[PDB]
C-alpha cells in the first residue's frame, strides 16, 4: 500500500533518493560534451557507455550519502561498490522499467525509448537475452506490486550484500544487513494484503538480479576483450577490480 507505519530506515532512504529530472539533465549534459569519435564504431555505443558510466556516478553519489556506509572508511566502501556495482546498475534499469512501463519498449535514463524490435534486429543474441530476461524480471516485479519503499530498501540490501570476511568493519555492516532485512520483512508484512511471502519473493528477485548482473559483466568483458570499450571507462575499471 502506501504507509502509516513505515520502518525508519526506509523513510530515511526515501529522503536520500535523488531527483530523477536532475540526474537525467546531468547525464544528458555530460553526454553533450565533445568526444574523440571512433571511425570504426557507431557513436551511439560510446554515448551509451558514457551514459552507464554517469548512471553509476549518480549511484555512487547516492551511496556516499547513505547511513552506515558514510560511517565506513574508503577500503570497505570500495570493496562493497566493487562487489555490487553491476547489481545496482541493473536494478536501477529494472526499476526504471517498472516505474514507467511500456511492454513494447525499454526506457533509458536519458529519457529516450528503445523498442524491443530494434533490440531484436540490431543487437547481438547476448544483449538481446539480457534485455529480455531483464524484462521478465520487470514483469515479475510488476506482478508483485513493487513500490518505492521496497525499492530503496532493496537497493540498500544490495549495497551491503557481501560476505563479512572481506570487510574491515564487521559488526557495523552486520547490523546494517540485519536491520535492512528486518525493515523489508516488517514493511512487507505490514503492507502486503495479497498472498505469498513477498519478502522471500523479493529476495529471489534479488538473486535473479545478481545472475543478470553476472551476465552483464560477461557482456562488458566481451566488449573489453575486443577493444570496443572507450579508454578510461569507469565500468571497465569496476570490472577489472580484484574480485571478493
Amino acid at each position: 500500500s502506501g504507509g502509516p507505519n513505515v520502518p525508519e530506515l526506509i523513510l530515511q532512504l526515501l529522503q536520500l533518493e535523488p531527483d530523477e529530472d536532475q540526474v537525467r539533465a546531468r547525464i544528458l549534459g555530460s553526454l553533450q560534451e565533445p568526444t574523440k569519435s571512433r571511425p570504426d564504431q557507431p557513436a551511439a555505443f560510446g554515448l551509451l557507455c558514457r551514459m552507464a558510466d554517469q548512471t553509476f556516478i549518480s549511484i555512487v553519489d547516492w551511496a556516499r550519502r547513505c547511513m552506515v556506509f558514510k560511517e565506513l572508511e574508503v577500503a570497505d566502501q570500495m570493496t562493497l561498490l566493487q562487489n555490487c556495482w553491476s547489481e545496482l546498475l541493473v536494478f536501477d534499469h529494472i526499476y526504471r522499467q517498472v516505474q514507467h512501463g511500456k511492454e513494447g519498449s525499454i526506457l533509458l535514463v536519458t529519457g529516450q525509448e528503445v523498442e524491443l524490435t530494434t533490440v531484436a534486429t540490431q543487437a547481438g543474441s547476448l544483449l538481446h537475452s539480457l534485455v529480455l530476461r531483464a524484462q521478465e524480471l520487470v514483469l515479475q516485479l510488476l506482478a508483485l506490486q513493487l513500490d518505492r519503499q521496497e525499492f530503496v530498501c532493496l537497493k540498500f540490501i544490495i549495497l551491503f550484500s557481501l560476505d563479512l570476511k572481506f570487510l574491515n568493519n564487521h559488526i557495523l555492516v552486520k547490523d546494517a544487513q540485519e536491520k535492512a532485512n528486518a525493515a523489508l520483512l516488517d514493511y512487507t508484512l505490514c503492507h502486503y494484503p495479497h498472498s505469498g511471502d513477498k519478502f522471500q519473493q523479493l529476495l529471489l528477485c534479488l538473486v535473479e538480479v545478481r545472475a543478470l548482473s553476472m551476465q552483464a559483466k560477461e557482456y562488458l568483458y566481451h566488449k573489453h576483450l575486443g577493444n570496443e570499450m572507450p579508454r578510461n571507462n569507469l565500468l571497465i575499471e569496476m570490472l577489472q577490480a580484484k574480485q571478493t
Binding site: D61, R64, R65, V74, Q77, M78, L81, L234, E237, A241
Partner: peptide, 12 residues
C-alpha cells in the same frame, strides 16, 4: 589511481 577512489574522496 582509480576513478572510484577519486569519487569517494571527492568533496561532498
Amino acid at each position: 589511481p582509480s576513478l572510484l577512489k577519486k569519487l569517494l574522496l571527492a568533496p561532498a
